[PDB]
Amino acid sequence: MDERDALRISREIAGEVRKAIASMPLRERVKDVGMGKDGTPTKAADRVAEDAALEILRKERVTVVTEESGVLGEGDVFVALDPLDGTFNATQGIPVYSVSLCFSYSDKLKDAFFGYVYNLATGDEYYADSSGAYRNGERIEVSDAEELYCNAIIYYPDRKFPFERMRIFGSAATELCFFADGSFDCFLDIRPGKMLRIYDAAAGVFIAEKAGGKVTELDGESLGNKKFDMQERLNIVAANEKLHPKLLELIK
Amino acid sequence: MDERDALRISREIAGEVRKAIASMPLRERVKDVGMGKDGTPTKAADRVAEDAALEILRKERVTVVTEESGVLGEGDVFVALDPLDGTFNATQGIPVYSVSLCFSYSDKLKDAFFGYVYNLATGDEYYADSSGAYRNGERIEVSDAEELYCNAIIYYPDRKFPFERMRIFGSAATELCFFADGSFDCFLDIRPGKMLRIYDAAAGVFIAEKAGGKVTELDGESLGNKKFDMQERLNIVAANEKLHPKLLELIK
Ligand SMILES: N[C@@H](CCC(=O)O)C(=O)O
Ligand SMILES: N[C@@H](CCC(=O)O)C(=O)O
Ligand SMILES: N[C@@H](CCC(=O)O)C(=O)O
Ligand SMILES: N[C@@H](CCC(=O)O)C(=O)O
Ligand SMILES: [Mg+2]
Ligand SMILES: [Mg+2]
Ligand SMILES: [Mg+2]
Ligand SMILES: [Mg+2]
């Protein structure tokens, strides 16, 4: 498989998932229909998303690692799938929720060759391949903010901070893209519990780096060795090269 | 003027403001074109919104209190107008920004008879009148959550909190409506600076109360005497009547 296949596949998936969710009323979306392999409830909105995405992905030779159904398939190409990221928003009809896909040539993030995040409520399309990073067909890049007085997405603020704005939109995959396109100056998930799973962050990290951002773990460590498995967990500190080390200091 | 006139007027305004913003590219939206009477800069997105709104409102016998141009007109009916609430989101193409209108028979919020918040990115319509509170024509009401382990919109978290979720979307008028329709269990603006202006909150507070929520200042004082002027500022604690006192305690 190559980055063209992955774009094609991701778009087909985006199409079907969007259709499926859009036809499900909010009262159905919000129903708890099962337990996911990740250890959190699967809502009806999650199940329909994942079913639609897997219908397409299983026709391919990949190992899929996805939130509700866990690990599936046997291909040498690994795909990290969040069939619905921002499920709470989707259940409330709040326009920030996405399907997220990251394709890698091994079970480690350093081998990612394609990343794709699609806002299911608005139609906004983010992806990145070897040619750069895109939002709705147009090249994007991270902001050049250097001061701590910047616009931050942060999970979660638990002390006074120097930021100009703090926002928390409820979909990490999309919010990483809000960072990737310059909307926000940084994305921080510093929750001590280390809550992000590989399928939450992977596409967002790949897109953000291709947009020029520096994206690391809590302590500046590379994310390259994060595994595409259900056990993997992440903290993220992401910002342009100038701002990144300042934030690392700040959150010490 | 009555509540039906206000619905009509608000819808006409929503239509034109939506048109005006939609046709304006993000690179133009974000331009700083002037200073607002509020004391914050006026973005070109703000200006085109306010102009479209005032074109319609001036044709009415009202006193308008609006962010960019301040206090206008002479009528006995006061209208608090945020022509564009969530301007930052609108400049980045993040789908949470709104026009907000609150109509009152005096210059105090206790005399409000109509409130209206319209998401310019999605077309979502919130309003409340004597018949109740609505979202896209459907009656809404606040959530029945009783525990501090709830879903919270809070500006800004600065300590450890017991919430299940914390979100900050960047449009106070809309976020009060997220509270009003039950999507979130509470809305909290407890920023010590007391930042919210009357046009940010008025419509949201009226809609939230009509939806059954309890909405007060920091200390539980009624918001009834808040003035429709440029000097007015607000903190807000809003939740159902069961949860509300617990939150008052939590931040005490
Ligand atoms: N909304 C599109 C997503 C991909 C695209 O065509 O840009 C679809 O129907 O698949
Ligand atoms: N129309 C978009 C999403 C829905 C919308 O337009 O709001 C799409 O085809 O994906
Ligand atoms: N007020 C909405 C339309 C609602 C309606 O008239 O049914 C708009 O013009 O943006
Ligand atoms: N502002 C457009 C958004 C388009 C859409 O989300 O369908 C509306 O009237 O709804
Ligand atoms: Mg789950
Ligand atoms: Mg999910
Ligand atoms: Mg201003
Ligand atoms: Mg404004």
Structure-token match 């009834």, residue found? B224
Residue ID of nearest Cα to ligand 3 atom 2 = B11
Q: Which of B138, B159, B186 is the last residue of a domain?
A: B138
Pair B134, B147 in one domain: no
Residue A221, sorted as left (phi over 0), alpha (psi -120 to 50) or beta, turns out to be beta
* Whether the CB of B9 sits within 6 Å of ligand 3: no
Provide the number of CB pairs (under 8 Å) joining chain A to chain B: 64
Residues B6/B114, Cβ–Cβ less than 8 Å: yes
One domain, residues B24 and B40: yes
End-of-domain residue from the set A138, A159, A186? A138
Give yes or no for A41 touching B (CB within 8 A). Answer: no
Q: Which of B11, B17, B114, B117 has most ligand 3 atoms within 8 Å of CB, for mutation? A: B11
Assess whether the C-beta atom of A123 lies below 6 angstroms from ligand 2: yes
d(CA B184, CA B181): 8
Q: Which two tokens stand for residue A74?
A: 């046997």
> What is the distance between the alpha carbons of residues B25 and A7, in angstroms, rounded to a whole number?
27
CA distances to A94, B180, B182, B197 from B175, in Å: 10, 8, 11, 15
Q: Which two tokens stand for residue A124?
A: 């906004």
- Which residues lie across from A129 on neighbouring strands? A132
Do A222 and A108 share a structural domain? no
Q: Whose CA is nearest to atom 8 of ligand 3?
A: B15
Closest CA to A175 of A165, A188, A159: A188
For B226, list phi and psi in degrees, rounded to 5. Answer: -65, 135
Which helix (H) or strand (E) element contains residue A239? strand A236-239
Other beta carbons within 10 Å of B18: 18
Last residue of a domain, one of A90, A118, A138: A138
Q: Which residues pair with A119 in a beta bridge?
A: A98
Tell me the two tokens of residue B13: 């305004």
Render A103-149 in DSSP notation, one character per residue.
Answer: EESSSBGGGEEEEEEEETTT--EEEEETTEEEETTEE-------SSS
Experimental technique, in short, is X-ray
Cβ within 8 Å of residue A32, ≥6 positions away: A41, A42, A43, A44
CA A215/CA A147 separation, integer angstroms: 17
Cα distance between residue B175 and residue A190, in whole Å: 25
* Helix residue ranges, H only, chain A: 3-22, 26-29, 44-57, 87-92, 172-180, 198-210, 243-250
B28-37 long-range contacts, CB within 8 A, separation 24+: B29/B90, B29/B91, B30/B91, B30/B92, B34/B68, B36/B67, B36/B68, B36/B69, B36/B70, B37/B67, B37/B68, B37/B69, B37/B70, B37/B71, B37/B230
| Residue A221 CB neighbours (<10 A) | 11
Q: Do B246 and B150 touch, CB atoms closer than 8 A?
A: no
B17's tokens: 């403001």
**Alpha carbon of B246 to those of B88, B219, B239: distances in Å?**
32, 12, 10
Greatest alpha-carbon span in chain B: 50
- Give yes or no: residues B211 and B164 share one domain: yes
**Do both A168 and A127 map to the same domain?**
no
Structure tokens at B176: 């009060």
- Decide if B149 touches A, using CB distance below 8 A: no
Q: Bridge-partner residues for B135, per DSSP?
A: B126, B138
Distances (CA, A) of A119 to A17, A169, A188, B201: 11, 12, 20, 28
CA distance A226 to B8: 55
Q: How far apart are CA B22 and CA B229, in angstroms?
A: 29
Asked if B70 and B194 touch (Cβ cutoff 8 Å), the reply is no
Please name the residues in contact with A104: beta carbons below 8 A apart, sequence gap of 6 or more.
Answer: A77, A78, A79, A80, A111, A112, A113, A202, A228
Of A171, A157, A189, the C-alpha closest to B155 is A157
Q: Which two tokens stand for residue A85?
A: 């990221």
Same domain (yes/no): A111, A145: no
Are the C-beta atoms of residues B108 and B226 closer than 8 Å to each other?
A: yes
CA dist., res. A182 & res. B6, Å (int): 39
State the Cα–Cα distance between residues B89 and A40, nearest whole angstrom.
Answer: 31
Start-to-end C-alpha separation, chain A = 41
Contacts of B60 (CB under 8 A, 6+ apart): B1, B9, B75, B77
CA of B66 to the centre of ligand 7 (A): 9
DSSP code of residue A87: H
Coil vs helix vs strand at A177: helix
| Cβ atoms within 10 Å, residue A195 | 13
In total, how many domains does chain A have?
2
Is B118:B124 a contact under the CB 8 Å cutoff?
yes
Residue A161 is part of which domain span? 139-252
3-state secondary structure of A235: coil
Asked if B49 and B148 sit in the same domain, the reply is: no
Domain at A238, CATH number:
3.40.190.80
Mutation pick from B151, B169, B176 vs chain A, by most beta carbons of A within 10 Å, is B169
**Residues shown for chain A:** 252
Cα–Cα distances (Å) from A49 to A56, A85, A244, B199, in that order, read 11, 10, 35, 39
Residue with tokens 């029945």: B144
The answer to whether the Cα torsion of B189, B190, B193, B199 is positive or negative is positive
CATH number at residue B64: 3.30.540.10
A238 and A215 assigned to the same domain: yes
B5 annotated as a binding-site residue: no
First vs last C-alpha separation in chain B: 41
If asked whether residues A9 and A125 sit together in one domain, one would say yes
Q: Which token pair is A193?
A: 């519990």
Mind giving me the DSSP string for chain B?
--HHHHHHHHHHHHHHHHHHHHTS-HHHHT-EEEE-TTSSEEEHHHHHHHHHHHHHHTTSSEEEEETTTEEEE--SEEEEEEEEETHHHHHHT-S--EEEEEEESSSBGGGEEEEEEEETTT--EEEEETTEEEETTEE-------SSSSEEEEE---S----SEEEB-S-HHHHHHHHHTTSSSEEEE--TT--B-HHHHHHHHHHHHHTT-EEE-TTS-BSTT-BSSSS--B-EEEE-TTHHHHHHHHT-
Who's near A249: CB < 8 A, 6+ residues apart? none
d(CA A187, CA A190): 10
* Same-domain status, B192 and B152: yes
Burial of B222 (0-12, 13-18, 19+ CB in 10 A): exposed
- In angstroms, the CA B184 to CA B170 distance is 15
Choose among B237, B224, B230: nearest CA to B200: B230
Is residue A59 located within the same domain as residue A109?
yes
Q: Which residues pair with A152 in a beta bridge?
A: A166, A186
Are residues B107 and B201 both part of a single domain? Answer: no
Q: Collapsing DSSP states into helix, strand and coil, what is residue A32?
A: strand
Residue A23 DSSP SS3 = coil
Pairing of strands A236-239, B41-43: unpaired
Helix (H) or strand (E) holding A36: none
